Amino acid sequence: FTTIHIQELACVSRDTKLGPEEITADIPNVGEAALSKLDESGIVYIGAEVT
Amino acid sequence: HDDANRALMGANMQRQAVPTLRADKPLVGTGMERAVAVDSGVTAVAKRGGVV
Amino acid sequence: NNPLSEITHKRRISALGPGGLTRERAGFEVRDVHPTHYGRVCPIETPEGPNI
Amino acid sequence: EEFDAIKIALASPDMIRSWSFGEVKKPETINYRTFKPERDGLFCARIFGPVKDYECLCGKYKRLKHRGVICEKCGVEVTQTKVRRERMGHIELASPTAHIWFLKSLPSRIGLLLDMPLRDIERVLYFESYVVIEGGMTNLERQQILTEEQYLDALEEFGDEFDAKMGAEAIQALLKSMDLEQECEQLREELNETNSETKRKKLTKRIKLLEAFVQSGNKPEWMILTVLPVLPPDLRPLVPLDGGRFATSDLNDLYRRVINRNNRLKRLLDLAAPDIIVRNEKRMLQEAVDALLDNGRRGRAITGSNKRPLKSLADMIKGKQGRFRQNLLGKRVDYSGRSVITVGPYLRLHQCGLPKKMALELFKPFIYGKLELRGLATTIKAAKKMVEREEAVVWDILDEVIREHPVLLNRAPTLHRLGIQAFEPVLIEGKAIQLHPLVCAAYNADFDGDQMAVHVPLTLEAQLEARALMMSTNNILSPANGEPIIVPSQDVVLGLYYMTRDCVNAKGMVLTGPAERLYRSGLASLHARVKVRITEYEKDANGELVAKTSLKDTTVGRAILWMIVPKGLPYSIVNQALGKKAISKMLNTCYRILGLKPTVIFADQIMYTGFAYAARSGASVGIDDMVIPEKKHEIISEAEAEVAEIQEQFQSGLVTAGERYNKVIDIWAAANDRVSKAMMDNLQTETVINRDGQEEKQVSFNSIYMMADSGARGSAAQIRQLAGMRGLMAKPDGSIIETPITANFREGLNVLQYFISTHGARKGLADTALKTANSGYLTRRLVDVAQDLVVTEDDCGTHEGIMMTPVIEGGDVKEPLRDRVLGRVTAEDVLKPGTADILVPRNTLLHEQWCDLLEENSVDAVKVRSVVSCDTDFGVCAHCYGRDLARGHIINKGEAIGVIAAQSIGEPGTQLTMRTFHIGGAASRAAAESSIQVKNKGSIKLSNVKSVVNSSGKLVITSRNTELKLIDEFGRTKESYKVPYGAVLAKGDGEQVAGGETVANWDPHTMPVITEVSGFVRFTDMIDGQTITRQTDELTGLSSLVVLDSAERTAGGKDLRPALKIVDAQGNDVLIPGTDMPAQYFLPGKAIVQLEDGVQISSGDTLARIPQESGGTKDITGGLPRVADLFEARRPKEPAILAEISGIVSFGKETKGKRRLVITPVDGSDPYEEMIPKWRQLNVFEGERVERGDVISDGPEAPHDILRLRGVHAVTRYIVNEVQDVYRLQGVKINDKHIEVIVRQMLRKATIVNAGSSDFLEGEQVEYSRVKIANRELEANGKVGATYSRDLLGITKASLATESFISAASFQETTRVLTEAAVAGKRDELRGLKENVIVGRLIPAGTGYAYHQDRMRRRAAG
Amino acid sequence: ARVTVQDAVEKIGNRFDLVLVAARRARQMQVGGKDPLVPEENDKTTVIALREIEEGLINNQILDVRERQEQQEQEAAELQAVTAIAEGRR
Amino acid sequence: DDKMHARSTGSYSLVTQQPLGGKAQFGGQRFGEMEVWALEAYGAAYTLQEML
DNA sequence: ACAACCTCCTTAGTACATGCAACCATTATCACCGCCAGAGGTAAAATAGTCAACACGCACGGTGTTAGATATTTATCCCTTGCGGTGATAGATT
DNA sequence: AATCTATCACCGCAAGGGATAAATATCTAACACCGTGCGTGTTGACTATTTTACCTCTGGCGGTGATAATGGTTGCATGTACTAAGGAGGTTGT
């Protein structure tokens, strides 16, 4: 009676006067272990556990 | 052997149910336990057949 | 939620909208039973609460 | 010292410039290559304040660096972003214009200042016509209307001192020339000798409006404004969004449309355009202003592309979503949460279980708030690594809370007090909320994945009062009466019943031991039949211990319960079977005698005592827990065979199709009820095989029967469906069907039996899911009327009171003296001779044993204090209520009777309109309410008693509260039974008994109304129609007369007292032997007389009955609508007349709609007239002649006229009986001290019937706490004043104009309320509860009653 | 005492004036540490506030007797010159 | 499993400075008018003023 | 003279409570194109600079040797096991 | 609160298991050397860092067209249940 689920979460980069917006991992001295799991683009890897 | 007020619940608890890691079949049953496995293609079935 | 629920969802029968009423602006014309339901529309495969 | 309260008026077009700064001039909010929110528009920082915090537009004054300035470069203020919340704007209206709540507000308000057609006043404001305004060179005069195509020459001789003009301008101009130093003083001389009626029904609305304007500071110009104030942007929060889009919503866009229309109307006047375009733009401007005010209400709505209307200003107030109900009287709250309920059987009664990470979340202010206060982290920033981790240092920081901290818990919707309580944390696993089993009953916790909520108190004061006031251990009892509802719960009480049941063979048919380990010695049972001498004790009221000793006949489980029982009450109380039927009364007896801690421990420790043994009972539901009577076979050879000829008798010509439906459904009912008799022998005793060595015919151990005799969850209506026959059902129309279910759930149900009973189930579950609204909405509106009754005072000097009685429906004792009197107080020195000639003085607190001394003398009436007999201003005096029922004491000065009483009615009505209707798949009743039966050897003691012997064969009781004690061989009482008046005795006084033995009996629906004496029958205190009405049958010719009292009577005899009698050979009373007084037998209504005058009868023979289907705490029942006008207090909208003059009756003065009857007294000389409705049925034509109000037609008596023609204590004695006796038929014995609240609050108002020199007017119904201004100065300075009284205004009228008017705005119909609050310019005093909820104060009850006392010595200094 | 608490109402006869007396002890501990005369048995400050009327003594209502008299037995000492002070008002 | 929703403090509705409400908002939850009637009925003014 | 009353006129004032899940579109509508602004472009020189040349000069890292540490092997030692002999416990009494 | 006999057993006190630490032998790593190549230095010529000047982009926004075109759109507020109020007007009465 353990169940298994698939759920979705998302984000955006708005049209600025140049055009892009930032996406990275820099949140210094706020919860460092909750950062250790990321791409160059600030995104988790397919296959990694997260909680 | 059931009142409508609990037959109503039976017609919904089987619907609120969810996929589980080690699933197992209704042993008691009506026969619909093989129709409802095919009435949305959730089991693949031999639309022509032959040898695998 | 699971296959049985989507299989019956595809054959749900609403009593609502232009041709019926709502949960709110309605009496029993949208909630009770009439005997020609026999062989055709089962009176227990509905949600519970005011949605009956 | 504190800011007192709040006052009202309207926004004068001049005075707005004391609160505002210019035209909000343009629609936009930005400017292309600059964010700088629009300079002069809907985000005008010059009118509303800065944008980012402190930030003006165009530069130089940003960050916390600059503040308290105005930037030169664009002329903009430098304050703070939130100044946009109250630095108001305005818009100058280029016409005088309406305000919707003075026009669309029925009754409305503009007409009440002009007395001119309300239908078309709106066109004068749409600027469609002209009117005459002013002058002294007059030729026409004022309020004369016109078109416009004439005016001319007369101005050369008259045109110095006269004027007339168009529309809204002309109305607003006329409203300059009245004079309140002369109008209001002259509007009152009609009140001397001459005043009329329908002109009073209208014009008193104006007279009250104008006097209220004078006494509050209002001005009539405020009906027709010339300036729109503008909603501050931060209330409609103008900002951009990251998605390049803006907060342009509704309360912004409505102002764009108004600004545009008004800026056209301006430009059209500025250019002097065609007046067509001006007239259209005036009409379009008023349309847009009134739609901005209350969108939709102006017969149309303003909308946008996703079809919807836009949210109006009034949608912050008028209906459900308004601030009062969505953001004030309830609101979203921090330090809180919710989750799914779970049973917590190791929590002690003061406790609740909470997951570690939920405790972390709920206690973050203790952690991010103490690390920095011990050094247990380097900073609150670094501590992110440690607090979210649930690290060790969190848990000292949390024991410093938990070890003495009261968590609050909640089971919304909180229709009753016990839905919220207080506890103590216990840390656990998981994601649920863990819930102590004894409070699961008090909450009604329903474990289908429904939820409860949590709130942390954080002030030292809230934690102090939570332990003192909300703690489970400290509120154990039912506020309606005083049985525990924090109580041994669902299966706990099967454990206690199991420990207290006994068996034949029993692994111990007689046997004993101590030691739980002897369940592992080889031969024991909790049903094994112990016997033991146990010395046993009973605490007196003085504190000493009445020691006793007795042989017992008991079990191991009954003996183990002497560990758990508080041994200052005697073992012999356990010598029974402790189902839900009985167990509450042990705790109740402990509460009556020992003390609080002893009663808590006795409730708490019974919980685990249940869990140790409930499982070991092995009680189940299963295929041979479902036995069936074999002899059902023989019964089917009766009932189906009776029907078989009866369906032929129809076809052969001896019945129609219709009587045949009843004459077969009644046989299906008789089939079910026949099988239901055989069913009980098989279910309870049928072990037949023929002893010796066989035939253990004992009282059964069938579980489905035990589920009902334990009271765990079973009933006779379940058992019928599970052991013999499911029976009969309703159709969707509510009435029964000729199509039975002769089978039961073990025999089965075919497709048709399922399908037909599913219609009745759908109907009942759909009413379950809807008719709650017809009780919950009423409960919401009830609290607004009910709130102010805080126990504030002590006796109130009200030396009067209601003559209450036991519930004696003439011919039953449905409630004894005890239950109704329960801790109320006397209002007379009551005395009744009979057995001990007892006297109970005035001002005595009637706890139960005062009733015992009165019930021995069979006391049947007592004058008592009442929540209606309470003079006290807003709050109430302690003598009027006496004892609280939930905490259980002499009622605390600070306890809020008002809300307690509303909750004590709103919950059980809404609860049982579900808990009975979800059952409609089957129907049945069964009863035993007709006899009394002895159970052991002993002797008989008649008590509480008179009784007589009868020539027709009987021995009969003749007293109202009678009892039948059972005594042993020596003098110990062993049982007692209440016994009705008219009950036939099968025993004499000092006679002897053995057991299995009937000792009294009466009719299944009646205690038969019976004589002391022999003589002719007679009537007294009775008049036909006016107190009684007729029924008749054949057989010999036959009679009966229904008695009528308080829903049924004509004016001419309202308060008569119908009383049967026994008399001599011609005339008068056969005086009652040994109490030598009149032989007269008083009744209420709803009883039915069954013998008449001139008949002649004996002592111990009968005269009247009731059709009492008994109800009870069973069978079950449910309903509500017939209660409504007992609290909305009108007349029937059809006056189906019952005539006010005797016998001589005709028609003769007919008129252009209604009939006109013409009538005369039987020995008079004086005719009268009556207006019977146009078409209405008459049951008479020429010979059918009666006293003043028999069934000529059928109109029931109007509830408001029960006040007008019988007075406040008389009407209270029936509203506090009819609604009370619906709840008594539901088994919900609410004490009368609760429905007396709703009657006090219809009586909230006080009629006044002339002018004076104080609080005095005509046509008025002032709040009673004001009009006492009469006694407050008449008796000290003489003054001048008028007649004043009390009224029965319904909830829909009494609420609209309370003095606590801040509460009344939440009532709904909020335009009707807020227009009266505007007219009266009204000024509150903070004296209910809701007013201090709205202003975020200490509420004037309990711990804030304890603060309102300080205000009561500011308002009284010297 | 944490373990059930309504007995502090039956100890007096009313229930909210109770909380004012409890608060009169409570603030004088939470903002003053003022001397006790019974122990705590872990009834932390919320319920030491109730201990004061489980007994009936240790709020300032008996400091109004004690410490207020330690002043007035100097007024008795010194009464020999309090006459000259009370004469010296004229 | 999905519905562990408690809160110390969090999101606030700029429209009224009151908490937002919602799991999808990490909101504060509604002490309703009926929930007030219980504290009014108890005479519990400081626990009520705390919510307000 | 007015008063309210007979009748069905229409108006319109309200419709209980707590919570969770979702995503944010549709319009067309010549903005014309004329003028010229300070204002875009860029050449030639201010605010000052590039990086290639030939020098300058240094750090770093990898290949080599050395060092010593460590984990293995060996063997010793103690603390522990399980049973047994018979212990002063548990607790009833003095 | 002291006394003990007589429990159920811990001690009474034999055996033996693992352990760890000694000595040996292996591993790696730390370093010191060397060599590479890069970012060690000034100088010099480049070309396009910046400025200002000039000649001549982009986009500021103001201005308003003519064979003639001259009675328009707009769809569903709501069907229920109550009932309080105002509105009507003739008249049989106050």
Give start and end residues of each alpha helix (H) in D638-750: 639-652, 659-684, 703-709, 716-723
- CB of B28 within 8 Å of a chain A CB? The answer is no
Tell me if residue D459 falls in helix, strand or coil.
Answer: coil
User: Would you call D362 and F32 a contact, using CB atoms and an 8 Å cutoff?
Assistant: no
Burial B16-36 (b: 16+ CB within 10 A, else e): eeeeeeeeeeeeeeeeeeeeb
Burial D408-417 (b: 16+ CB within 10 A, else e): bbbbbebbbb
Residue in A30, A35, A36 to test binding to D, most D beta-carbons within 10 Å: A30
User: Would you call B5 and D918 a contact, using CB atoms and an 8 Å cutoff?
Assistant: yes
CA D521 to centroid of chain Cα atoms: 57
Tokens of D458: 């954080």
Tell me the sheet residues that pair with D21: none
Nucleic strand G contacts from chain D, 1164-1183, CB < 7 Å:
1171, 1173-1174
**D590 labeled part of a ligand binding site:** no
Chain A stretch 3-22, residues whose beta carbon is closer than 8 A to a beta carbon of chain B: 3-4
Report in angstroms the alpha-carbon separations of D1182 from D1148, D1177, D1178: 13, 15, 11
Question: What is the stated resolution of the deposited model, in angstroms?
Answer: 17.0
**D440 labeled part of a ligand binding site:** no
Tell me the sheet residues that pair with D1252: none
| Cα–Cα nearest to D1057, from D1213, D1219, D1223 | D1213
Report in angstroms the alpha-carbon separations of D295 from D181, D283, D301, D309, D850: 39, 16, 5, 8, 63
Q: Is the distance from CB of D787 to CB of D779 less than 8 angstroms? A: no
Residue entry with tokens 């406790």: D351
- CB of C28 within 8 Å of a chain D CB? The answer is yes
Eight-class DSSP state of D468 = I
Q: Say how many C-beta atoms besides its own lie within 10 A of residue D1095's C-beta.
A: 11
DSSP-assigned states of every residue in D234-283: GGTT--B-TTS-B--TTTTHHHHHHHHHHHHHHHHHHTT--HHHHHHHHH
Residue entry with tokens 């409730």: D603
Number of H helices, E strands in chain C: 1, 0
Tell me the sheet residues that pair with D1145: D1159
Residue D412 Cβ under 7 A from any strand G atom: yes
DSSP-assigned states of every residue in D922-947: -B-----TTEEEE-SSEEEEEES--E
Protein CA at A40 to nucleotide C1' at H34, angstroms: 39
| Cα–Cα nearest to D169, from D279, D89, D72 | D279
C-alpha to C-alpha distance for D955 and D953, rounded to whole angstroms: 7
Angle (nearest 5°) at CA D425 between D420 and D427? 135
- CB of C31 within 8 Å of a chain D CB? The answer is yes
Gaps after residue numbers in chain B (C–N over 2.5 angstroms) = none
DSSP-assigned states of every residue in E13-60: S-SSHHHHHHHHHHHHHHTT-PPPSS--TT-TTTTHHHHHHHHT--SH
Protein CA at D45 to nucleotide C1' at H59, angstroms: 30
Footprint of strand H on the protein (CB under 7 A): C 25; D 33, 106-108, 111-112, 116-120, 201-202, 205, 299-301, 307, 1128, 1130, 1133, 1149, 1151-1152, 1292
Residue entry with tokens 């003009």: D165
**D448 labeled part of a ligand binding site:** yes
> Phi and psi (nearest 5°) for F35?
-70, -35
**D796 labeled part of a ligand binding site:** yes
Residue D200 Cβ under 7 A from any strand G atom: yes
Prior bond of D1117 cis (ω within 30°): yes
| Cα–Cα nearest to D368, from D357, D355, D352, D384 | D384
Q: What is the 3-state secondary structure (H, E, C) of D1331-1345?
A: HHHHCCCCCCCHHHH
Tell me if residue C23 falls in helix, strand or coil.
Answer: coil
Nucleic strand G contacts from chain F, 12-31, CB < 7 Å:
21-24, 27, 29-30
User: Would you call D769 and C52 a contact, using CB atoms and an 8 Å cutoff?
Assistant: yes
**D450 labeled part of a ligand binding site:** yes
Q: Is the distance from CB of D787 to CB of D897 less than 8 angstroms? A: no
Across the interface, of B8, B14, B40, the residue whose CB is closest to C48 is B8
The answer for residues whose C-beta is within 8 angstroms of residue D1142's C-beta and 6 or more apart is D1161, D1162, D1186, D1187, D1188
> In which element (H, E) is residue D587 found?
helix D583-593
CA D1280 to centroid of chain Cα atoms: 41
Burial D481-514 (b: 16+ CB within 10 A, else e): bbbbbbbbbbbbbbbbbbbbbbbeebebeebebe
Q: Which nucleotide is nearest to D1293 (CA to C1')?
A: H84
The answer for residues whose C-beta is within 8 angstroms of residue D1296's C-beta and 6 or more apart is D1304, D1307, D1309, D1312, D1313, D1316
> Phi and psi (nearest 5°) for D445?
-80, 125
Q: Which nucleotide is nearest to D119 (CA to C1')?
A: H87
* Chains B & C: contacts with CB separation below 8 Å: 41
Q: Is the distance from CB of D1087 to CB of D1041 less than 8 angstroms? A: no
- CB of B40 within 8 Å of a chain D CB? The answer is no
Report in angstroms the alpha-carbon separations of D1295 from C36, D495, D1121, D1304: 49, 50, 21, 6
The contacts found for D697-704 with CB under 8 angstroms, 24 or more apart, are D698/D503, D698/D504, D701/D503, D702/D625, D702/D627, D703/D619, D703/D620, D703/D621, D703/D622, D703/D625, D704/D621, D704/D625, D704/D626
- CB of A45 within 8 Å of a chain B CB? The answer is no
Protein CA at C8 to nucleotide C1' at H27, angstroms: 70
Our CA-based measurement puts residue D614 at a distance from the nearest CA of chain C, in whole angstroms, of: 33
> Phi and psi (nearest 5°) for D602?
-65, -30
Question: E1-79, which class in CATH?
Answer: alpha beta
Protein CA at F39 to nucleotide C1' at G73, angstroms: 78
Tell me if residue D438 falls in helix, strand or coil.
Answer: helix
C-alpha to C-alpha distance for D137 and D671, rounded to whole angstroms: 96
Amino acid type, D1351: R
Q: Is the distance from CB of D4 to CB of D27 less than 8 angstroms? A: no
**D352 labeled part of a ligand binding site:** no
C-alpha to C-alpha distance for D690 and D681, rounded to whole angstroms: 16
Residue F32 Cβ under 7 A from any strand G atom: yes
**Chain C partners of D758 at a C-beta cutoff of 8 Å?**
33, 43-44
DSSP-assigned states of every residue in D1058-1077: -EEEEE-SSSSB---TTS-S
Domain ranges of chain E: 1-79
Q: Is the distance from CB of D960 to CB of D1009 less than 8 angstroms? A: no
> Phi and psi (nearest 5°) for D229?
-65, 150
**Chain B partners of C43 at a C-beta cutoff of 8 Å?**
4
**Chain E partners of D887 at a C-beta cutoff of 8 Å?**
6, 9, 15
Amino acid whose CA is nearest the C1' of G21: F24
Nucleic strand G contacts from chain D, 86-105, CB < 7 Å:
104-105
Angle (nearest 5°) at CA D542 between D541 and D545? 85
Tell me if residue D1033 falls in helix, strand or coil.
Answer: strand
User: Would you call D903 and F41 a contact, using CB atoms and an 8 Å cutoff?
Assistant: yes
The contacts found for D552-556 with CB under 8 angstroms, 24 or more apart, are D553/D529, D554/D529, D554/D530, D555/D499, D555/D500, D555/D501, D555/D502, D555/D526, D555/D527, D555/D528, D555/D529, D555/D530, D556/D508, D556/D512, D556/D513, D556/D524, D556/D525, D556/D526, D556/D528, D556/D530
Residue D489 Cβ under 7 A from any strand G atom: no
**Chain B partners of D730 at a C-beta cutoff of 8 Å?**
none
Tokens of D769: 């899911």
C-alpha to C-alpha distance for D95 and D124, rounded to whole angstroms: 12
Amino acid type, F34: M
**Sign of the CA dihedral with D925 first, then D929, D931, and D933 last:** positive
**D870 labeled part of a ligand binding site:** yes
